[PDB]
């Protein structure tokens, strides 16, 4: 439980027809946290004191 | 640098990040204010015409405070917390009891005030949407969710309730709360807010949705051509450069009351003003050193409040206990006007 | 501020 693995912003793909590159900025993009809320997480870490 | 807008500052602001904001209904004279923070409080100022705050009061949870609504009267503030409860807080008295109990944290509180019935609608991560008269300890009403609770809005006779896994569902509340419909969602991200919009006539005909990977969602509940009347569109992204994209996360969405057009805020520490019929973006703020993690308008749409705070985006390493929450108050009724 | 196009999927 929490965050403890760092935060890695995903790559990705979307159009602007050309495709252009993209870095996710949200943890929960991550695939060790797409199942999780953003303050899911945030209380996990609160009540293990990792702040 | 921290208030780049040059918008007001609330005095007296929350010791830890904002969870959310309220304002007073049209029923209490004047303008207040509710906060609810991640310090477990929940605090109300007066904001006055000349626009100084006064702070007014604080109740305090046990728990984070996640959600927070008004009683229509506003006589009421209800209360909704990580300690697995809700409060109903009477200003007058300073007195605030429990009313509401879950198996897990209370993400959502709304008030449902329909010709023949008053409740309290609780959405929660233990996967159930609860209704409450206040003074029973029994819930008038359960209904199962199909996933834990990420947000949800209320303007009667409507509910839309966004979970976990794109669940969507719309309520019909006239009566009694039941199922209308569940919504295949439009968006293929995380759900994180929601806020119903009305149509020409003041009544509740659809919603926008905001996910974490800069997009929102128009949705239309019956238009006459869905694939062309409902439409996504992005928000919240950085941009002339090839390098890549930033996406952060649509913290909160709310629309002007009188205007119809709606605001968006963002990890991305900015906010945008939308026309959704026009299809236009109005305004889009300058960048604030940290997210804006909550916003929401006054009952005449005279004052746009947004909350600077970390949002936990990018998880526990960049949080800074040290780094000042702000609530921020800026006359937007001229910004948000159509055309 | 300016108004713009939005970015529609």
């Known amino acids: 439980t929490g965050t403890t693995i760092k935060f890695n912003p995903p790559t990705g793909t979307d159009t602007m027809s050309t495709n252009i590159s993209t870095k996710h900025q949200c943890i929960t993009a991550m695939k060790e946290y797409e199942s999780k809320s953003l303050e899911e997480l945030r209380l996990e870490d609160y009540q293990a004191n990792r702040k | 640098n921290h208030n780049p807008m040059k918008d007001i500052e609330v005095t007296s602001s929350p010791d830890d990040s904002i969870g959310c904001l309220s304002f007073s209904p049209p029923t209490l004279p004047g303008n207040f204010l509710i906060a609810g923070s991640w310090a477990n409080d929940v605090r109300c100022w007066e904001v006055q015409d000349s626009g100084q705050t006064i702070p007014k009061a604080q109740q305090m949870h046990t728990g984070p405070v996640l959600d927070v609504c008004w009683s229509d009267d506003g006589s009421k503030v209800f209360t909704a917390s990580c300690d697995k409860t809700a409060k109903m807080w009477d200003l007058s008295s300073n007195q605030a009891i429990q009313i509401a109990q879950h198996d897990a944290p209370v993400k959502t509180i709304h008030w449902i005030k329909a010709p023949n019935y008053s409740c309290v609608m609780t959405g929660s991560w233990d996967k159930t949407l609860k209704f409450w008269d206040t003074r029973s300890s029994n819930p008038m009403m359960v209904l199962q969710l199909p996933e834990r609770c990420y947000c949800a809005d209320v303007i009667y006779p409507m509910a839309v309730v966004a979970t976990a896994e794109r669940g969507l569902i719309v309520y019909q509340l006239e009566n009694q709360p039941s199922e209308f419909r569940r919504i295949e969602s439009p968006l293929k991200h995380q759900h994180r807010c929601v806020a119903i919009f009305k149509d020409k006539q003041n009544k509740p005909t659809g919603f926008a949705l905001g996910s974490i990977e800069g997009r929102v969602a128009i949705h239309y509940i019956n238009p006459p051509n869905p694939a062309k009347d409902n439409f996504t569109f992005k928000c919240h992204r950085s941009n002339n450069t090839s390098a890549p994209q930033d996406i952060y996360a649509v913290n909160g969405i709310a629309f002007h009351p009188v205007h119809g057009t709606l605001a968006t805020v963002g990890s991305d520490g900015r906010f945008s003003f939308w026309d959704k019929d026009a299809r236009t973006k109005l305004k889009t703020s300058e960048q604030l050193d940290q997210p804006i993690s909550a916003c929401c308008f006054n009952h005449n749409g005279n004052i746009f409040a947004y909350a600077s705070s970390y949002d936990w985006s990018k998880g526990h390493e960049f949080y800074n206990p040290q780094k000042k929450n702000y609530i921020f108050l800026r006359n937007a009724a001229e910004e948000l006007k159509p055309r | ?9």
């Open chain 3, 1 to 9: 501020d300016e108004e713009q196009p939005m970015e529609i999927d």
